[model samples]
Target: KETAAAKFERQHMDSSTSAASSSNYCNQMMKSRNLTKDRCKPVNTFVHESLADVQAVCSQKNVACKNGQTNCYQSYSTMSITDCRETGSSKYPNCAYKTTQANKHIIVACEGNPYVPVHFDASV
Candidate 1:
């Protein structure tokens, strides 16, 4: 019989490998944002952070991470707005123009643990 710690380690290793492979494939398909002339980076910082967040949550919950998946989509609209009238137009605008950006949502499954954390990355 495998101890919980050993099982968890095994599962985590397998899951991490799978997640990395999948992420790399997805990254390839994603269009890169040109921040500089010499370098192109993904605009999806949220997706990266969300993966770390999911791992932390699982570790904190003592769950053996099993599988991970991500979905990407476009979102256009403002979820929230701040009052900028008092701040002046130079400091802030009354209405913020929002552009459509890709959103990445991650689903993490755990083995031998019922609690799993599903994370959404809307700032991608």
Candidate 2:
């Protein structure tokens, strides 16, 4: 069974491939990664950093999550990432995305034994 940590990595981590300049990045990634399985994911973000670098955010400063949880932490350093937003005209099977790259401090919710990111809270 895939752990939550593994799921998080699959859904958000992108340690390799820095070609965020490609307009089709999210369109391809969101599909290849299976985010477009049933319904199109409305919004998603991919962190262009190693798993270790992202996991370390678990030890960063504590902060409140968008859902009012207090177990979230924001990365101390800004990291390169890509945001995938679904286009308004996009349909389920044909999920379309608009890609935008940025460097920002990420907020994530952590949990479990070897505490790791479980939810991508936000980017600041």
Candidate 3:
């Protein structure tokens, strides 16, 4: 059985490469907002999928599904967590997880406009 960490690592492998050159955007954005330099963290861009889709994939892989009620999200830097919810409007309603402590950016590889990294208001 694959552990959550292992699954997450496998799913988000492309993030490292996709985020490589573009990651500087995150740091620049953080600086613009007057946040500390270390506040920037990179998240990988895994293939987006909906909750049902993710469940199916996990089932195929024999990985335990956390269930639809599991409130999971990715944490970036020391500040934020983007909850992975199953909403119809979500880009990848089937599967989406944020990589925490990431390098500096997210590399989304969908056909349309790419999803940019969301900066959390740490002051809150």
Candidate 4:
């Protein structure tokens, strides 16, 4: 069974990439990560940091989750990340996205026996 730790790495961590100038970045990545399968993903984020760096966020001060969950934690330092959001496409079935990068503190939801992050809350 893939643990929450492993799942988080697969879905979010991207250490080598930086501020990509290509407008098609989200177009490729959103589908590359297999998120475009049955339904188009509404919004997604890719954190450009090491696995250790992302895991360290669990030690930071806690915060109320955006969804009102109590077990969320926010990072103390700003991180390089890409936010992918859906934009309208003139060609209906083919999806489109707006890609933007920023340095911001991230919020995540921690859970389970060891209390690792299972969900990305938001970037602040």
Candidate 5:
């Protein structure tokens, strides 16, 4: 079974690249990550930071999630990230994406003993 923390990693973490300028980055990454298996993921984001750095956000000041949950935390510093948005013409199993890269403070929800990121809330 895929744990929420692990799912978070699959959906968000990508520390190797600083910024993705390639038009093919999202199309490749989204499919590579298995997000396009059944249906097109309308939007997604990749954070270019280490797992440790992202997990550490669990211990930072807690904040309210967009859904009104109190377990979310906002990163203290900005981090490099890429956003993926599906093109209007994209279809299931043939999903296509557009990539937008930037640096921003991220918000995530945490849980469990290790207090790792379990959900991505937003970026600020």
Candidate 6:
């Protein structure tokens, strides 16, 4: 089975596409990344920074996860990011999304070997 940590990378990480301001990015990436399948993921965030830089977020400011876990950490600086939000008209196989670009501190959950990021909590 693919680990949650690995899935996060496959579905969300795109260092190569960093700061790509195309609004269609979500509509395209969210699907190409396989986030649209049995159902839309509703909300997802893509970090436009290098994997190493994002991994370093785990050692930054600590915060509370939405599920009440204290494993969340916040980035110390604003980073390039693309937030994908499912549109109301979005349906199963035809999932559509709105892309928003922003420069803000990101929050993520850390776990496992090397203590890197596993889950994206949110951005602030």
lDDT of 1 by residue, 1-124 (tens): 8554343332222222222233233223222222212323222222223233444434432322333232222223221211111112212212221122232333233333443433222321
Ranking by lDDT: 2, 5, 6, 4, 1, 3
Task: Give the TM-scores of the predictions, in the order they appear.
Answer: 0.19, 0.96, 0.21, 0.88, 0.95, 0.94
- Which lDDT tens digits does candidate 5 get at residues 36-61? 98789899989998989988988886
The list of candidate 4 runs beyond 4 A from truth reads 90-93
- Candidate 4 lDDT (Cα, 0 to 1): 0.81
What pairs collide in candidate 6?
Answer: none
| RMSD, every candidate, angstroms | 16.8, 0.9, 16.1, 2.0, 1.1, 1.2
* lDDT scores of the candidates, listed in order: 0.28, 0.94, 0.28, 0.81, 0.90, 0.88
For TM-score, candidate 3 versus 5, the one ahead is: 5
Which residue ranges in model 2 land beyond 4 Å of their true spot?
Answer: 19-21
Which candidate has the highest TM-score of all?
Answer: 2
Tens digits of per-residue lDDT, candidate 6, 1-124, equal 7887788798768898758569799988988888887789899999999998988998999999999999999999999999999999988888889999988999999998879788898899
For model 4 the TM-score comes to 0.88
List, residue by residue over 80-121, the lDDT tens digit for candidate 2.
999999999999899999999999999999999999999999
Poorest 10 consecutive residues of model 6 by lDDT?
Answer: 12-21
Candidate 3 lDDT, 31-111, residue by residue in tens:
343322242223323333332332222222121113432222232222221222222332321222232232322222111
- For candidate 3, what is the lDDT? 0.28
lDDT of 5 at 43: 92
Candidate scoring better on lDDT of 4 and 6: 6
Order the numbered candidates by TM-score, best leading. 2, 5, 6, 4, 3, 1
